[PDB]
Design a protein around this ligand. Sequence first.
Ligand SMILES: CC(=O)N[C@@H](CCNCC(=O)O)C(=O)N[C@H](C)C(=O)NO
Ligand SMILES: [Zn+2]
Length: 255
Amino acid sequence: MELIKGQALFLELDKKDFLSLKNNDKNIPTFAHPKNQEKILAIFSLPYKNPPQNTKLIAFYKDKKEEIFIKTLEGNYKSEKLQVENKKIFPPKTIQERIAKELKEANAIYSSYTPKALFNGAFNIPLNSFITSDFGKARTFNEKVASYHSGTDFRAATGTPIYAANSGVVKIAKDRYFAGNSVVIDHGFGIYSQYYHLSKIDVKVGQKIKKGELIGLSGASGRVSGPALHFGILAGGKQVDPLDFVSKFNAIFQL
Ligand SMILES: CC(=O)N[C@@H](CCNCC(=O)O)C(=O)N[C@H](C)C(=O)NO
Ligand SMILES: [Zn+2]
């Protein structure tokens, strides 16, 4: 198949006599297809930066192996040039220490697989606004991708109510460098939704959260370009296009 970089894909496989799904030595977890009872699903994601040109997954059954080839497409993302580049910039050690601490914490959370659905039906947009800045907007130097927008920004004045996109469990709920006042919800199967730059947090860590229920107010914390909501989805161990993902997810899990 063909898959644009920075997107997710729902693999469909025969359930019966299935043993494992792999990508080199890396395992990929599977879950039940809710409509069809003879199928199982698995989420595969390509990174936006440095994606492999091609990927070969192998589904091992008791009676056969079954290869899946996935071609990486460049897509149609916006891209501006730079005349500056990296400089592994030199922050004060007090901040280096904080970033590294918050990075450790995030990786422990995002690599903590929950093998059951914590969601309830389809995802909803966290607020009824519109996109001010799209996912995948990139800054290039010598046609190599330096950085990119890892989520999508909605129009929101400071203090706009934000609602949970789907049911889950709260894993993060605090101020962080870069993200500002953050909230991260685990929905199960390595699917996490992210709500950054809040002015105000209304939830606690480990709290069981329901869809359409309030998680905080929008703001501009840790943000330079002013008030707005940043919404992100991490799935298959990677940041992916949220709106593209929601479309594909809802196609399957719609009630
Ligand atoms: C901690 C961090 O690096 N956050 C990045 C996105 C990556 N999230 C991964 C994570 O939080 O673990 C970020 O805050 N981008 C802001 C929202 C932006 O681009 N606004 O316009
Ligand atoms: Zn953003």
